Structure formats: C-alpha cells, structure tokens
Amino acid sequence: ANVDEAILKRVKGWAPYVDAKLGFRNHWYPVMFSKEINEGEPKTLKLLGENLLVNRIDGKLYCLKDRCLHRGVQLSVKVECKTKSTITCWYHAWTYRWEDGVLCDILTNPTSAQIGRQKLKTYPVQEAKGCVFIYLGDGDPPPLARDTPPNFLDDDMEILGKNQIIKSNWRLAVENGFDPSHIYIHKDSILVKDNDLALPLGFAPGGDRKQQTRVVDDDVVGRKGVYDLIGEHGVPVFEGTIGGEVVREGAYGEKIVANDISIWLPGVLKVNPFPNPDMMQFEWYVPIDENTHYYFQTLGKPCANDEERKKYEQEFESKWKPMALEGFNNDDIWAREAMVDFYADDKGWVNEILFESDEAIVAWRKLASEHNQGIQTQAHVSGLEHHH
C-alpha cells in the first residue's frame, strides 16, 4: 500500500516489513510518561500518522482522535472542555464524550439529526510502570504483555526513562538497536570507561545460520521476537586489524553487560544486563510518521521498597541518564539519522550489501513480516476507502 510494488516484489522475504513505513496497526505503543499527563490537561501527539488527544479524567486516561468529524480540524487548535466528561470543537461546537467518542451534543444546533448518530474514533489507553500505552488498533485490545518484552511488567521492576522525538523512520531505529556489529560506534562512549565495561568491537560468528538467533513464537502470553545469539559460538573481537596490524582495541573492563539482546514486536529492544550488571534496558522505537519516531528509553532495576526506589531515582538522574541514556545512546541517534538518505526513496531495501552479523536483522525482518497485526496505511490516516 505504502511502497512501489516493484520494490515489494523484489524483497520476497519481508515485503510486509518494507511496506510498514507507518508502523504496524493493532499493537500497544508507549507515547509518554504518566507524570506528563495531568487531570483535565489534554495533550496532543501523533502516533502511526494519526493526530490524537489524550486527557485524564477522575485520574483515568482517555484517547480521542484529534480530528473533528465535521470539517476535519484538530480540536486541539483551541480546546474547549465545557463539562468534565466532554470536549466541544471550537468551530461549530460539536461535542464528544471522552469515554466513547459519541457525538452527544451540538451547541450550534441542538435539533440536529447528527446528535447520537456519529462517533469520533477512540483508542484504548493503559498506564503501566509510569508509562502511557495506546492501543493503536481496532476492536478489543489484547493484553499489554503481548507487546512488551519479558520482565518489563514484573512486580518489583522499577522503570525510569526518557522520551524524545528522533528524525528517522522507526525501522532504522529498530535495526540499529538489534544490530550486533554496530557496537563499534560505542567504543569511545563515556559509559565504557566511566562504568568499567567490557565491550568488544564486534564478533566473528560461529556455527550455522539457525544458531545465530532464537526466534520466539511460542511464548504463552503471545509475545513475538528474536534473541541475538551471535556470542554463543562467536569469538568476540577485541583487536581490530587492517592488513593484520592492530589499529584499535576493544574495552577490557570487569563488568559484563548485554548477555542477552532481544527485539520484540511491535518494535521494542531488551538489553540485559545494561547499563550495569544489576539493571535492564528496554527501548521502544514508536512510529510517529514516515520520517520520525519516539525514542522511548526505559531502565529497569528491581527495587523492593520505597527507600530503594528513591535511591534508584537519584542514581538515574545523576548517573544513568547522563552517562548511559545520553552518553551511550546519543551515538545511536546520529547513526539512525545517517541511514535516512539511503532508505528514504525505499531503494536502500534493495541496494544494501549485508554481511554475516546481519543474520539477526534478517530474522527480525521475517518475524515482523509474519507476525505483525496489520499494516498502517495513509488511508487509515485520511479515512478508509472501499467501493462496492
């Protein structure tokens, strides 16, 4: 729907994934932190190309499409919440209920036949671990757990994070994150020295193709993803050579991190342990539009009580966020941006020349192609089209 069909016909292994420029419909996605959305203070965001309004009413989150049914303006140009349970479009005062989107009043015409006979699109919203998830999909949502990596929802796991808008397509973000060899770009990160990490420059793979990954499609909660097992039969590279001469070394610190790396639908990476041996990193790359994504970074650490939580929160603000979320992952941001031009015309999906560590990326591409719950199209954005 989204890409030149001549290109889709070439990429037989993963055409759905190449077509999913706007992301995958019918999944849960995080879009902000709980503390960023206050009672009666509606917030605008764009997710999978759709303009949405979120509001908190009696503490509960509600999500409406930020587009009046009448003449297609954003309600948010001038929000008019006149009662606690409704929003009134500023234009002709069509009035909608937060709770089901039903057009329940029209101030400019109380006798109008449209009253009670139209419904503004609503989306399910759920807060978990201080994060706001929207189900950008149709009908009854599945459990959140389906679209979260293992352990993110564990009872004791305290989650802190950061979110920002990055100018690349979401798929470039996913591939960069799950790419075993991209670790090269991190060799001079302030975290490697200042947190005493062991960090190789890359990996010489071993064994066969099937052993490079573990495809998970039998998890009881229905989650779908891929573990990167390059390090199980591979020799890590600590001495980088040109013409047999050593020109760069890896890092020989004591702390072992990133024993398991997995990517999960709809596009969330889990690195464990990271950035410290007692912590985990979970990061989402959430499609906003064809050119941009939320980089939704979270760090998880088991905390057993409120004293530990506060201690973690203080370590996060003073150490982990500046040293790891920024000091390590800032290089990922500009890496992602550097691939935009090659893939922007969709030709990079044909012309890329892969090597052996990209087996992990290929496994993800095929997983995502087979198990996604639907392809978002520009028609979902503008209004679905069908001729009898």
Binding site: A113, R117, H386, H388
Partner: protein, 106 residues
C-alpha cells in the same frame, strides 16, 4: 400510523426510488428492486444528502454527495465514506398498494 400508504405498486418501475415525506418525522426512501420493495431512512447517514436523489444499482443505493453507498435490504454501508447503518423500514404490498412501516426495525 403503523403502516403508511406510499403508492400503487404499479406506480414504481424496477430500479427506482420514491421519497416518503412524514409530518413530524424524517423522510423515508422506498426502493423497488425487481418486484420487491425495501425502505430506509431517506437522509444519508454520512451527512444531509437525500438518498432518493441517488443512483440505485441492484440493491445498493449510491449517495449523490460523496459517493458513499448502502445495501437497501440490510441498511449496511457498502461504500466509503458511509460507516453508520441506515434505519430499515418494513414494506408490505396489500391489494397492490405499497405500505411502509412508520417505525424502523429493532
């Protein structure tokens, strides 16, 4: 009243539509599909158009404003941008006179 006299069945050709205006209520549309008769609300559910000014193609009425369409038997949308089903009204022929219900089904 419960049954509203429309016209004689012979006063409608196959593939035509008649509007039925009602005091105190919204208009209906009656459709002749072959020898059978169906009725819906006359106002398109996508807007303010009159479906009786549309085009009937078999049992599908096409709205004249935006090209949305409905199945006249079921009232269900058949073409975008229509999404809200029409009210369906029972039609009966008694002594070759067409009658349409004054209240919709369900």
């Amino acid at each position: 009243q419960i049954w509203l006299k429309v016209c004689a069945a012979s006063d409608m050709q196959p593939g035509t539509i008649r509007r039925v205006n009602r005091v105190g209520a919204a208009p209906l549309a009656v459709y002749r599909v072959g020898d059978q008769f169906y009725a819906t609300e006359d106002t398109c559910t996508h807007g303010i158009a009159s479906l009786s000014e549309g085009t009937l193609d078999g049992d599908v009425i096409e709205c004249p404003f935006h090209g949305g369409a409905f199945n006249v038997c079921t009232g269900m949308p058949a073409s975008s941008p229509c999404t809200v089903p029409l009210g369906v009204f029972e039609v009966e022929v008694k002594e070759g006179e067409v009658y349409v219900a004054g209240e919709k089904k369900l």
